[PDB]
């Protein structure tokens, strides 16, 4: 029964339609955020330094 459920869900998700919006791999995105956050922090730091100057 669970195999039939899985195959019907696979068919439904394959048939499902979405507007053309890019959506990156589920596992990695979180890591990217962390890096992005750090980037902003660094940028902010540099910005502060620039303003300080």
């Amino acid at each position: 029964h669970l195999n039939f459920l899985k195959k019907r869900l696979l068919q439904q998700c394959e048939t499902l339609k979405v507007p053309p919006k890019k959506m990156e791999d589920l596992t990695n995105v979180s890591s990217l955020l962390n890096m992005e956050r750090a980037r902003d922090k660094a940028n902010e730091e540099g910005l502060a330094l620039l303003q300080e100057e």
Binding site: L47, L50, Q51, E53
Partner: protein, 52 residues
């Protein structure tokens, strides 16, 4: 935009930096000239009085 701001502020600083020096030396030399010429006028008048 902050990097451009860097560009204009550094340009203004490097332009204004030399401007102080010539004005300072001109002020100093003119003040020295004034003091020297006032002294010299005093001495020439005093020596003329001595001669008379």
């Amino acid at each position: 935009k902050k990097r451009q701001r860097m560009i204009e502020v550094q340009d203004e600083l490097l332009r204004l930096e030399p401007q102080l020096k010539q004005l300072q030396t001109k002020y100093d030399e003119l003040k020295e000239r004034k003091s020297s010429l006032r002294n010299a006028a005093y001495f020439l008048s005093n020596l003329k009085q001595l001669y008379q």
